[model samples]
Target chain A: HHHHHMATVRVQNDDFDLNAEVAALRARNPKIGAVACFVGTVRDLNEGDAVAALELEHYPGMTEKALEKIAAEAGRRWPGIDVAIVHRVGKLYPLDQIVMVATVAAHRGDAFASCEFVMDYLKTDAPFWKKETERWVDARSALARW
Target chain B: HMATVRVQNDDFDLNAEVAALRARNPKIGAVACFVGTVRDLNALELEHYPGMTEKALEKIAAEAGRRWPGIDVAIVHRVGKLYPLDQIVMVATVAAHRGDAFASCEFVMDYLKTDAPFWKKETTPERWVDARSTDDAALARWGIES
Candidate 1:
């Protein structure tokens, strides 16, 4: 409830505004000098064919655990950075945002690196899937630790 | 007027910027954003050499585009006095993938930090200041010098 620690994870169906989320997480804290964020959206196509819509599903407890782990790893690697992750579930259409990842730090280097690292790590986690071709599938990167 | 650089006294909303970019580039999948804020400082005045500042930012953004091929970069920097926790600058990038977007966004900021014709004067000390020497190391990582 308190904003002492920086890591926050939400696997919900509600859409998020990138600027508002970043500002809220940053909280205008005096120690925050830089803020970094990433937005992943449902584009017109994924892989080569058109994508009418994508319905995502996540295992309640499992999804939250994976996100926490990803955020922790990002902090360990970058030191002194705070993380916020919000992954949208349920049906989504083109131009709709699918996820938002943000990191706040005392400097720009840690902010940018940590945010991207969290994203690269998020791509490797499980429990979050999208229904494609009538089958649920988890999207993972071929290879990249970030 | 250069599209890559927006130097203004008015505040900006990150969500609006990204949303506009998304509407134009439907194929882009990743957007990286960085916001620099004044932390714990009483106040400061940010100034820039009007024409030259825009030109320099345009060149830096162009280099990022050529390097990443499909990425688009934009920078919005505030000009005038700012107080603690106030947003000072923003660098955003969009690309087909996370790596390209993240890298290009960082690259543009690094170049801008060291090479952009922006001036900052601290009201506490009441004198113009130069960019920190440590900033060169960030530039050095990309094999470039200022």
Candidate 2:
């Protein structure tokens, strides 16, 4: 099923290549003047502690649905834009990629804005558990609970 | 080097281009990239003023670096015949934070669109594309005359 011009969501344990994914997102569109991508990696140092690795878990079917919604919201906000969201579950080492959000549009503004909007929405609403890795909590997550 | 610019006919590897920018720079925490591709049109023939085009791209990248300190930028633009779905141009920026990366990357792209000396002949539509006022408006946001 070719889901071109629609949001693509993938929640898997396998890692993804940022370049390959982005190139695929913007390919086949001469009118695509810009593609904006935000790649989030597992940092070695989080919460000012030495992180050995990260373990992420999600509510399977529910999580994918939530991400799909977020991606859809981004598309609505920025018309004629394509969005791709890939999140890796399971154990990941320091420096390993965690999430990638890519957006393509006829102009740079839409691309950049949509990509960042999707990422921001994902961090707040996505149902992902980082508790298995005690040191992985960040300020955003802390405020999210309040 | 703070800025890297290239104008060529050969296709480029997005992963390699981005990796080279982040390599050896542990302080860089964010990377924002924009990739342009040929769209619905059957094909496009891009023409650029060899010496002048490269210099213009370099100037745009350099200006972006200067505007956003502690940032590095890379720009690659393709010329000659390009079929639909073919990659055309890419702009990548790395910085210590997302704001800088996002802003610098978009700024570079905006300037490149309006300031660069590149012309496009669309085969599908059989017309020569000219600069758009929207592009000029985008560049105007930077408070600099294009």
Candidate 3:
């Protein structure tokens, strides 16, 4: 069969373009009738403050590995589909692209299901922290010490 | 089942992709397409890693499906250096009714904006920059409150 599963994963200190990614996905998969995606942008205001700069940090090896696992698990759960993930790390400013994820499925259900699953894991699983210009947006543990 | 999502170092033709989807599925009565370009301009080049990006996008699409019922979704994004009018993102939805199709397309894009872990950057005269212009409140419409 000529059909191939197109999934991508990335870790870098730079930004990405959401539109370009969507086009590639559709190009590779002929059955994709609809495309749903999200692009993240830095806001001028955060907790009511004049934002200036940001410094993000991560556990290096651990962060990438965790993200890899997250993507891999998604593939296992939702087989025979296409997925894309991109994340940026390093010192950033007030308005910057930090991360992005997009999913495509035959039906909206599978697409929506897989998308959220990746996000839930991302916010909770990825080993990274953001030091906003004024405040820190930490990926705090969703797991409570009970 | 087939799906597609991308965040890459390439550009895509929206008209062509939409045409392909329609060609593949005669059941698509209505097809809605949305494109996000380099509006708030900057001079920085877009960057990303491949494998991680594919995975992230698919997962987010799944979330979109859950929120917007009965729709076919596809999303494309560009990565790497881009100038004015460069396509940043594209999302298309197909459905039996235009209303459902349009709503699902916008709805999915909204979630991708507010919830997806993605970011944008640009380089202006003074410096290279990123766009932090997003609607977190829009996400609250989906019970996503901060």
Candidate 4:
């Protein structure tokens, strides 16, 4: 079967390249009509403190499983969607790439919905935690929302 | 697996990667890409776990595929320490129309900012701090409750 959905978990880095993401999408499935993607970067200012570093935490197996579920759910909602998600962990700095998500569909609707839906679910459902400065925000097994 | 996610301590070549994809699919009518930049302020550096980062990202990409119907996607994140203004991340979409490229790109970015796993830290001549999560309300615009 020409499966379209994919998910992954990593604890190595928090920055990704946009070109790599796009190139992968075009490599397969010539029938794809619409391709939507999202990427997140670290900003220099947040809540006034001079942020020097960030440390990410996750519940290991649980985090990956939840992310997989998010991707699966998106695929189930739409037929032509070929989606992908990538997230980084550990310490990172401002201007670095943090996460990437993409959706491929026969039309803009499927790609748009599935892409946004996966992101929302990842924020609300994924189990992850982060430590910033003096505080360690205890989050779900996935990553936390802003 | 046809797809891959890696969390290595190295940089990636965007043009070279995309060229590979285009070579594989000549029918691709349009290839739109988004490049994220690392700001020059606050003098920052980055770091990550390597193996785990790719895993997290792949999981996220999988979620994105599920939501989008006719899109094709992939992502590449860098690991280890980085400098300011460095290429943080890049997102590329392959679709039949510009609408899909634009909408999918924006939608993916919206959720990536609001969701996904990754945090950032900023370094100054005087202090260091961690990056904060994005606003929940902003994420809600994508029809999500994060």
Candidate 5:
């Protein structure tokens, strides 16, 4: 069996760019024919509440290791595939992207399957706590809480 | 159906395109994207029946929307000259959940591969690409006969 491809995983407080992430995954790999990507964003409403922002907290070192494992498992399941995962921490507003999973393969099916698989596992298994806050009335109101 | 189909030679920003899809749609919870890129060959020359190609893509997008209600679809393809690693095509679907978005996006791509009237030629030892049985089999998985 061939050696498995390296998995790229990042858990950070900064935002991510889909184009940059996807392009970087496909770089130096001319055999990559297809790339499948999924992005989960912060919505304005969740569970019937108008959300003002989302606060995501995670165990830094452990979270990154878990993501790496998830991506590596995806690589194992789909041979000749590459994976990239980025999950954001800290506060995020509506329309703000939360997580991104990208998979690249020689064919579309493998790429699509690997991408979705990683995302599914991440949602249920990753050690990330997401707290939805009520929509802020104003900047002054939020500052008052601080 | 809210579907956008474009066949052009210009490169596109994957981030911008996806952002546009979910701009005003607060209900969209998942965005699935598949990007096909030129691979293995030094250069790719794509030819298409201009007017008919767009129509065919639109039809495929419409079919996806019909099958997966409440989904928005976008199909974009590049023609003319392209280098290895250059994006050849992109298909995206946005829905309230991941399953619908994934299914519809893959369905559109499967149909597009076998049904769309696009001819491809590769250079650096040039040759025309012939339709493969795998593509036909892919479409058949969806109960589509072509």
Candidate 6:
């Protein structure tokens, strides 16, 4: 049976603890048997471009709400699953976490699919961007595509 | 491309595993993880041959790397008795993009379920149980005829 769930999304600059976040998500629901998660981290180089630090900015409410809307869509598209997304904004150093999307469910298939779906939308659909030193980077050839 | 596979009796920390993947490699932009827990049963008992099981899991990880190059794979499966809500297995993948990370993570899991040599006995009815077709169908999605 499908269960009602909402994806908890947050846009913050503070680094997140992967274990802590996932543990809390499953703590309340013991019925949850599976968890699928995707985390995006800052890389030192992007397409041979030497990057020291990545500075990101976003619309206060618009970006936050956009995450919520897509997460809600994820809930509807895949039943019996829970999703959570955390996208970091501001100055991020190399190896720093940039974003994370996690999904949980009774079955691994649902969890895996929903987790990927949320991430897919975040990459290709969700309105997000980053920047280089003095050079404003457009979210990696950033274009809307499925 | 790197793969780390372990079959142990002790539980694992997903945080540490995920962190280690991107520690030195600042180019890794995506990380995907899957954690399986005990469900539909009060508890679970897992059994496997020490050397043989790890070999099977490594084979699965190797195949995942072969399919998706430039991705890192880590698989940890627990043996011995486990209670409900207890984590059973974990597969974490690292890549430059979310697509490769997510697909490789799921690929390892799909193969781990079928190709890996492990036995499970549910505590509810105290039976050594196995599957029929669900796992096979999962593996087939990757173009492998199960």
Local accuracy of candidate 4 as per-residue lDDT tens digits, B22-67: 4443343344444443434443444444545555556555555566
What is residue A73's positional error in candidate 5, in angstroms? 1.0
Question: Each candidate: what lDDT?
Answer: 0.81, 0.77, 0.61, 0.56, 0.80, 0.79
- Residues B32-144, candidate 6, lDDT per residue (tens digit)? 99999888553668788789888878888888878888888888889898888888999998888887998888888888777777777766736766532355476778998
- Candidate 5: true contacts recovered, fraction: 0.77
TM-score of each: 0.89, 0.80, 0.45, 0.45, 0.85, 0.87
**Which pairs in model 6 have colliding backbones?**
none
Per residue, candidate 5 scores C-alpha lDDT tens digits across B25-117 of 676759999999888753778888879989989889988878888999888888888887788889988888887888898999888887888
* Per-candidate chain B TM: 0.88, 0.87, 0.77, 0.72, 0.87, 0.87
Expressed as tens digits, the lDDT of each residue in A110-143 for candidate 1 is: 9988887788778776467778888988765443
Clashing pairs in 1: none
Comparing 1 with 2 on TM-score, the higher-scoring candidate is 1
A1-146, model 2: which lDDT tens digit per residue? 88765336879898889977776766644466567887766544444324436678888888899899988888788889888889988777766677888988886788888987787778878888774435534322322321
Candidate 2 chain A — worst ten consecutive residues by lDDT sum? A137-146
Report clash pairs, candidate 2: A28-B85, A29-B38, A29-B39, A30-B38, A30-B39
User: Candidate 2 lDDT (Cα, whole model)?
Assistant: 0.77
**Poorest 10 consecutive residues of model 1 chain B by lDDT?**
B129-138
Model 6 C-alpha lDDT per residue in residues A10-91, reported as the tens digit of each score: 8887888788778877875567779999888877664443444778877788787878887888889887788788888887
| Total clashes for model 5 | 0
Q: Give the per-residue lDDT of model 3 (tens digit) for A42-78.
A: 3333433243345667777787778788877877887
lDDT of 6: 0.79
Off by over 4 Å in 2: A1-7, A23-34, A42-55, A131-146, B121-135
After superposition, which runs of candidate 1 have C-alpha atoms over 4 Å from their true positions?
A: A1-7, A45-51, A142-146, B1-3, B122-125, B131-134
- Alpha carbon lDDT at B33, candidate 6: 92
Indicate the residue-level lDDT of A109 in model 4: 51
**What's the CA error at residue A70 for candidate 6, in Å?**
0.6
* Per-residue C-alpha lDDT of model 4 across residues A4-28, encoded as one tens digit per residue: 6543433335456555665566445
- Candidate 5 wrong stretches, greater than 4 Å: A1-7, A46-51, A132-146, B122-134
